[PDB]
């Protein structure tokens, strides 16, 4: 074989492709796209209205039994109308398999909280609101989790500066820690690392 190239597993790829169609046939109302990657990962892309139907089916259906929410996060892609892409990574212990479910929202459109399906989603959705600003409807207790109290903005957005807008310091006149506009003794040095030559022809986007 080739010592340095990752071996392929066509059996898992075929199995996940068949199961992707299986879900798409059972939830046409919501599924918008299904794809399987070259390393055997299945992604189900759905309408944001189908969060509770699709996740509930995947958790409870006998042939799915995805009873674990491994991770719930979001990605900011400012070029899209709906900036944020909400990603649910699920694990099935019954079938020793994983599935990824993706939806989308924007700054003002809320998404239905997944706490009714998976209790683990409670703190993951608090982090998405805190870092990305996506609002989850009917969340039992939604509020900042990671950032400081009174922190303005949502750091993990692509238009939020790396060092933020304010910085802390102890002032002896007021005898407390104060917040002032950020000044850096050394500015972060922006490196332009991209190579002007195409690396992967297989992903060439048509002009």
């Amino acid at each position: 074989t080739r010592p340095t190239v990752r071996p392929r597993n066509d059996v898992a790829h075929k199995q996940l492709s068949a199961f992707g169609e299986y879900v798409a046939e059972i939830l046409p109302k919501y599924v918008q796209q299904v794809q399987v990657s070259c390393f055997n990962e299945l992604e189900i892309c759905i309408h944001p209205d189908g969060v509770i139907p699709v996740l509930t089916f995947l958790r409870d259906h006998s042939n799915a039994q995805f009873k674990s929410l491994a991770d719930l996060t979001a990605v900011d892609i400012p070029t899209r109308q709906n900036r944020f892409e909400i990603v649910y990574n699920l694990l099935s212990l019954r079938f020793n398999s994983r599935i990824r479910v993706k939806t989308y929202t924007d700054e003002l459109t809320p998404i239905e909280s997944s706490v009714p399906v998976y209790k683990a989603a409670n703190w993951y959705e608090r982090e998405i609101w805190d870092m990305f600003g996506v609002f989850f409807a009917n969340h039992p207790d939604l509020r900042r989790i990671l950032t400081d109290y009174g922190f303005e903005g949502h750091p993990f957005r692509k238009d939020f500066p790396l060092s933020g807008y304010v910085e802390l310091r102890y002032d002896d006149e007021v005898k407390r820690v104060v917040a002032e506009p950020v000044e850096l003794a050394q500015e972060f040095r922006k490196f332009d690392l991209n190579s002007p030559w195409e690396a992967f022809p297989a992903y060439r986007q048509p002009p």
């Binding site: 050394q186 972060f188 040095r189 490196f191």
Partner: protein
């Protein structure tokens, strides 16, 4: 394969029940614990007599940064900024210009030892073994400014520790 850690059924015969009754009333398993601490009292402690004895290290130890020279005294650094580009913490600031004799050399080489994570990526990325992490780990200061190294400080560290840096590199360059 798997195994159960706590799935035993305590035998309920009279002898076994009385064995547990003696354990409860006579504190047998608690005294068994005192035996273990008593034994440690009579072992030799593992403490070393610092600073008169020092903990063992290896040639690969990543300590204080330093700038080296060739056997002639010429600086090894030729201002290529690979250490600056790789440094994950952006702790290295470099400026360079053609020297008086026309050589490619730095006019500034600062390592903010308070941004540095002592990762060693600088000594890996250097193609002339100029910047290294020496074996000194005792250079704590009394002020924050003393940890902002410039080229003069880094060259002095190289001249200071060249006797030990060279022997460490000699003992490890074949693994690199």
């Amino acid at each position: 394969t798997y195994k159960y850690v706590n799935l035993r059924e305590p035998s309920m015969d009279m002898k076994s029940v009385t064995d547990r009754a003696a354990q409860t009333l006579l504190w047998t398993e608690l005294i068994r614990g005192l035996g273990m601490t008593l034994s440690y009292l009579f072992r030799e402690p593992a403490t070393i007599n610092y600073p008169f004895e020092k903990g063992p290290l290896s040639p690969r130890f990543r300590g204080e940064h330093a700038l080296r020279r060739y056997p002639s005294g010429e600086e090894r650094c030729i201002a290529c900024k690979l250490c600056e580009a790789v440094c994950p913490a952006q702790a290295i600031t470099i400026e360079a210009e053609p020297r008086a004799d026309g050589s490619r050399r730095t006019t500034r080489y600062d390592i903010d030892m308070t941004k540095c994570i002592y990762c060693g990526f600088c000594q890996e990325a250097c193609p002339v073994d100029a910047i290294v992490e020496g074996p000194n780990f005792e250079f704590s200061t009394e002020t924050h400014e003393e940890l902002l190294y410039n080229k003069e400080k880094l060259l002095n560290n190289g001249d200071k520790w060249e006797a030990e840096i060279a022997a460490n590199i000699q003992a490890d360059y074949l693994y690199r």
